[PDB]
Amino acid sequence: GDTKEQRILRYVQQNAKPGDPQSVLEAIDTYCTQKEWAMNVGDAKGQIMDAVIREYSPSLVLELGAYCGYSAVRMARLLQPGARLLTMEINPDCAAITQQMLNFAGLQDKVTILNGASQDLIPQLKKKYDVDTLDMVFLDHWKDRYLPDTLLLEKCGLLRKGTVLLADNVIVPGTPDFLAYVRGSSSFECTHYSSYLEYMKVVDGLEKAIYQGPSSPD
Numbered sequence: 781g782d783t784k785e786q787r788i789l790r791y792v793q794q795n796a797k798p799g800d801p802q803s804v805l806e807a808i809d810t811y812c813t814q815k816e817w818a819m820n821v822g823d824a825k826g827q828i829m830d831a832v833i834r835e836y837s838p839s840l841v842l843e844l845g846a847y848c849g850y851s852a853v854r855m856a857r858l859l860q861p862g863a864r865l866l867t868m869e870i871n872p873d874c875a876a877i878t879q880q881m882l883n884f885a886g887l888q889d890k891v892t893i894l895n896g897a898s899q900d901l902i903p904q905l906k907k908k909y910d911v912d913t914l915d916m917v918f919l920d921h922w923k924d925r926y927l928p929d930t931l932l933l934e935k936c937g938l939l940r941k942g943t944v945l946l947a948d949n950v951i952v953p954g955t956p957d958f959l960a961y962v963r964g965s966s967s968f969e970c971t972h973y974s975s976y977l978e979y980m981k982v983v984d985g986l987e988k989a990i991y992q993g994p995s996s997p998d
Protein backbone atom coordinates (compact mmCIF):
# COMPACT_ATOMS: atom_id res chain seq x y z
CA GLY A 781 0.00 0.00 0.00
CA ASP A 782 0.85 3.70 0.23
CA THR A 783 3.88 4.65 2.31
CA LYS A 784 3.53 6.81 5.41
CA GLU A 785 5.76 9.34 3.69
CA GLN A 786 3.66 9.86 0.58
CA ARG A 787 0.53 10.13 2.72
CA ILE A 788 2.05 12.77 5.00
CA LEU A 789 3.00 14.92 1.98
CA ARG A 790 -0.48 14.40 0.50
CA TYR A 791 -2.10 15.58 3.72
CA VAL A 792 0.08 18.69 3.85
CA GLN A 793 -0.57 19.62 0.23
CA GLN A 794 -4.33 19.23 0.79
CA ASN A 795 -4.62 20.94 4.17
CA ALA A 796 -1.73 23.28 4.92
CA LYS A 797 -1.14 26.80 3.62
CA PRO A 798 1.71 27.35 1.10
CA GLY A 799 4.56 29.39 2.49
CA ASP A 800 3.27 29.06 6.06
CA PRO A 801 5.73 26.73 7.80
CA GLN A 802 3.74 26.65 11.05
CA SER A 803 0.70 25.41 9.11
CA VAL A 804 2.84 22.68 7.53
CA LEU A 805 4.10 21.52 10.93
CA GLU A 806 0.60 21.54 12.39
CA ALA A 807 -0.78 19.55 9.47
CA ILE A 808 1.88 16.87 9.79
CA ASP A 809 1.26 16.59 13.52
CA THR A 810 -2.52 16.52 13.10
CA TYR A 811 -2.34 13.71 10.55
CA CYS A 812 0.25 11.65 12.42
CA THR A 813 -1.74 11.99 15.65
CA GLN A 814 -4.85 10.73 13.89
CA LYS A 815 -2.88 7.73 12.56
CA GLU A 816 -1.35 7.15 16.01
CA TRP A 817 2.18 7.25 14.63
CA ALA A 818 3.84 8.16 17.94
CA MET A 819 7.35 8.76 16.60
CA ASN A 820 6.00 11.15 13.96
CA VAL A 821 4.21 13.58 16.25
CA GLY A 822 6.81 16.30 16.60
CA ASP A 823 5.27 19.12 18.61
CA ALA A 824 6.69 18.14 22.02
CA LYS A 825 10.25 17.70 20.74
CA GLY A 826 9.65 20.78 18.59
CA GLN A 827 9.28 23.02 21.64
CA ILE A 828 12.76 22.00 22.72
CA MET A 829 14.19 22.36 19.21
CA ASP A 830 12.71 25.85 18.82
CA ALA A 831 14.23 27.02 22.11
CA VAL A 832 17.67 25.83 21.01
CA ILE A 833 17.48 27.68 17.69
CA ARG A 834 16.15 30.84 19.37
CA GLU A 835 18.88 30.87 22.00
CA TYR A 836 21.90 30.10 19.83
CA SER A 837 20.85 31.56 16.45
CA PRO A 838 23.03 29.15 14.45
CA SER A 839 24.10 30.20 10.95
CA LEU A 840 24.95 26.69 9.79
CA VAL A 841 23.05 23.65 11.04
CA LEU A 842 23.57 19.99 10.11
CA GLU A 843 20.66 17.56 10.47
CA LEU A 844 21.17 13.79 10.36
CA GLY A 845 17.96 12.12 9.19
CA ALA A 846 15.33 14.09 7.26
CA TYR A 847 12.46 11.62 6.73
CA CYS A 848 9.59 13.80 5.37
CA GLY A 849 11.05 17.14 6.33
CA TYR A 850 9.24 17.93 9.58
CA SER A 851 12.36 18.82 11.54
CA ALA A 852 13.91 20.58 8.55
CA VAL A 853 10.83 22.82 8.27
CA ARG A 854 10.79 23.25 12.06
CA MET A 855 14.39 24.48 12.17
CA ALA A 856 14.56 26.32 8.84
CA ARG A 857 11.51 28.45 9.65
CA LEU A 858 13.48 29.99 12.56
CA LEU A 859 16.80 30.42 10.76
CA GLN A 860 17.81 33.91 9.64
CA PRO A 861 17.99 35.08 6.04
CA GLY A 862 21.17 33.71 4.55
CA ALA A 863 21.55 30.94 7.17
CA ARG A 864 21.83 27.33 6.02
CA LEU A 865 20.53 23.93 7.05
CA LEU A 866 22.27 20.88 5.55
CA THR A 867 20.24 17.71 6.00
CA MET A 868 21.61 14.25 5.33
CA GLU A 869 19.20 11.52 4.25
CA ILE A 870 20.19 8.05 3.13
CA ASN A 871 16.85 7.10 1.52
CA PRO A 872 16.35 8.91 -1.79
CA ASP A 873 12.59 8.51 -1.58
CA CYS A 874 12.61 10.35 1.74
CA ALA A 875 14.94 12.98 0.30
CA ALA A 876 12.38 13.45 -2.48
CA ILE A 877 9.44 13.92 -0.11
CA THR A 878 11.49 16.26 2.09
CA GLN A 879 12.33 18.37 -0.97
CA GLN A 880 8.66 18.64 -1.91
CA MET A 881 7.78 19.50 1.70
CA LEU A 882 10.30 22.32 1.80
CA ASN A 883 9.07 23.70 -1.53
CA PHE A 884 5.52 23.83 -0.18
CA ALA A 885 6.73 25.62 2.95
CA GLY A 886 8.73 28.13 0.86
CA LEU A 887 11.93 27.25 2.75
CA GLN A 888 13.80 25.35 0.05
CA ASP A 889 16.43 28.03 -0.46
CA LYS A 890 17.59 27.74 3.17
CA VAL A 891 18.06 23.98 3.04
CA THR A 892 20.37 21.67 1.13
CA ILE A 893 19.37 18.01 1.15
CA LEU A 894 22.44 15.77 0.91
CA ASN A 895 21.44 12.34 -0.38
CA GLY A 896 23.65 9.69 1.18
CA ALA A 897 24.74 8.06 4.42
CA SER A 898 25.96 10.37 7.14
CA GLN A 899 29.11 8.29 7.52
CA ASP A 900 29.94 8.89 3.83
CA LEU A 901 28.91 12.53 3.63
CA ILE A 902 30.37 13.91 6.85
CA PRO A 903 34.01 13.50 5.60
CA GLN A 904 33.03 15.46 2.44
CA LEU A 905 31.66 18.52 4.22
CA LYS A 906 34.96 20.42 4.49
CA LYS A 907 36.20 20.09 0.93
CA LYS A 908 33.15 19.32 -1.19
CA TYR A 909 30.67 21.55 0.68
CA ASP A 910 33.16 24.20 1.90
CA VAL A 911 32.19 23.91 5.55
CA ASP A 912 34.41 25.42 8.25
CA THR A 913 32.66 24.32 11.43
CA LEU A 914 29.02 23.66 12.24
CA ASP A 915 27.09 25.87 14.65
CA MET A 916 24.56 23.14 15.48
CA VAL A 917 23.98 19.46 14.77
CA PHE A 918 20.59 17.75 15.11
CA LEU A 919 20.99 13.96 15.41
CA ASP A 920 17.87 12.01 14.45
CA HIS A 921 19.02 9.17 12.22
CA TRP A 922 20.03 5.55 12.93
CA LYS A 923 20.44 5.32 16.70
CA ASP A 924 23.64 3.23 16.59
CA ARG A 925 25.27 5.96 14.54
CA TYR A 926 24.84 8.82 17.04
CA LEU A 927 28.09 8.08 18.87
CA PRO A 928 30.13 7.03 15.80
CA ASP A 929 29.05 10.09 13.81
CA THR A 930 29.76 12.41 16.74
CA LEU A 931 33.27 10.98 16.89
CA LEU A 932 33.54 11.34 13.10
CA LEU A 933 32.43 14.98 13.22
CA GLU A 934 35.10 15.60 15.88
CA LYS A 935 37.84 13.86 13.88
CA CYS A 936 36.99 15.73 10.68
CA GLY A 937 37.32 19.07 12.51
CA LEU A 938 33.69 20.05 11.98
CA LEU A 939 32.98 20.98 15.61
CA ARG A 940 34.20 24.11 17.36
CA LYS A 941 33.96 25.30 20.92
CA GLY A 942 30.31 26.32 21.21
CA THR A 943 28.87 23.93 18.62
CA VAL A 944 25.51 22.69 19.92
CA LEU A 945 24.58 19.04 19.40
CA LEU A 946 20.91 18.20 19.94
CA ALA A 947 20.03 14.50 19.87
CA ASP A 948 16.48 13.08 19.67
CA ASN A 949 15.12 9.78 21.02
CA VAL A 950 17.97 9.38 23.51
CA ILE A 951 15.67 7.44 25.86
CA VAL A 952 13.19 5.66 23.52
CA PRO A 953 14.39 3.53 21.87
CA GLY A 954 17.51 5.04 23.42
CA THR A 955 21.11 6.00 22.68
CA PRO A 956 22.76 5.01 25.98
CA ASP A 957 26.34 4.79 24.62
CA PHE A 958 26.06 8.26 23.08
CA LEU A 959 24.75 9.64 26.39
CA ALA A 960 27.47 7.99 28.44
CA TYR A 961 30.11 9.44 26.11
CA VAL A 962 28.99 13.07 25.99
CA ARG A 963 27.98 13.19 29.66
CA GLY A 964 31.29 11.64 30.75
CA SER A 965 33.48 13.69 28.41
CA SER A 966 35.02 17.01 29.40
CA SER A 967 34.59 17.98 25.73
CA PHE A 968 30.79 18.28 26.13
CA GLU A 969 28.54 20.14 28.52
CA CYS A 970 25.17 18.44 28.57
CA THR A 971 21.55 19.17 29.40
CA HIS A 972 18.63 16.72 29.24
CA TYR A 973 15.08 17.65 28.17
CA SER A 974 12.07 15.40 28.70
CA SER A 975 9.75 14.87 25.76
CA TYR A 976 6.56 12.84 25.84
CA LEU A 977 5.55 10.20 23.33
CA GLU A 978 1.83 9.54 22.91
CA TYR A 979 0.26 6.06 22.81
CA MET A 980 3.29 4.48 24.41
CA LYS A 981 2.72 7.17 27.08
CA VAL A 982 6.44 7.34 27.81
CA VAL A 983 8.84 10.14 28.65
CA ASP A 984 11.50 10.14 25.95
CA GLY A 985 14.09 12.88 25.84
CA LEU A 986 16.56 14.97 23.92
CA GLU A 987 20.11 15.69 24.92
CA LYS A 988 21.82 18.99 24.28
CA ALA A 989 25.61 18.56 24.27
CA ILE A 990 27.69 21.67 23.71
CA TYR A 991 31.20 20.99 22.44
CA GLN A 992 33.98 22.60 24.48
CA GLY A 993 36.88 21.95 22.12
CA PRO A 994 39.10 18.87 22.02
CA SER A 995 40.65 17.19 25.02
CA SER A 996 44.32 17.88 25.73
CA PRO A 997 46.62 16.13 23.24
CA ASP A 998 48.49 14.80 26.28
Ligand SMILES: Nc1ncnc2c1ncn2[C@@H]1O[C@H](CSCC[C@H](N)C(=O)O)[C@@H](O)[C@H]1O
Nearest residue numbers: 845847850851869870871897898920921922
Ligand atom coordinates in the same frame (compact mmCIF):
# COMPACT_ATOMS: atom_id res chain seq x y z
N1 LIG B 1 23.26 6.61 8.30
C1 LIG B 1 22.27 7.46 7.89
N2 LIG B 1 22.56 8.57 7.22
C2 LIG B 1 21.57 9.37 6.80
N3 LIG B 1 20.25 9.21 7.00
C3 LIG B 1 19.95 8.10 7.68
C4 LIG B 1 20.90 7.18 8.16
N4 LIG B 1 20.27 6.15 8.84
C5 LIG B 1 18.95 6.46 8.76
N5 LIG B 1 18.76 7.63 8.07
C6 LIG B 1 17.48 8.32 7.91
O1 LIG B 1 17.15 8.87 9.18
C7 LIG B 1 15.75 9.14 9.18
C8 LIG B 1 15.24 8.92 10.62
S1 LIG B 1 13.62 9.60 10.92
C9 LIG B 1 14.04 11.35 10.91
C10 LIG B 1 12.85 12.12 11.41
C11 LIG B 1 12.98 13.64 11.21
N6 LIG B 1 14.22 14.20 11.78
C12 LIG B 1 11.80 14.35 11.85
O2 LIG B 1 11.91 14.91 12.95
O3 LIG B 1 10.74 14.30 11.22
C13 LIG B 1 15.09 8.29 8.10
O4 LIG B 1 14.50 9.04 7.05
C14 LIG B 1 16.30 7.44 7.62
O5 LIG B 1 16.25 7.04 6.23
Ligand SMILES: [K+]
Nearest residue numbers: 962963965968
Ligand atom coordinates in the same frame (compact mmCIF):
# COMPACT_ATOMS: atom_id res chain seq x y z
K1 LIG C 1 30.31 15.97 29.62
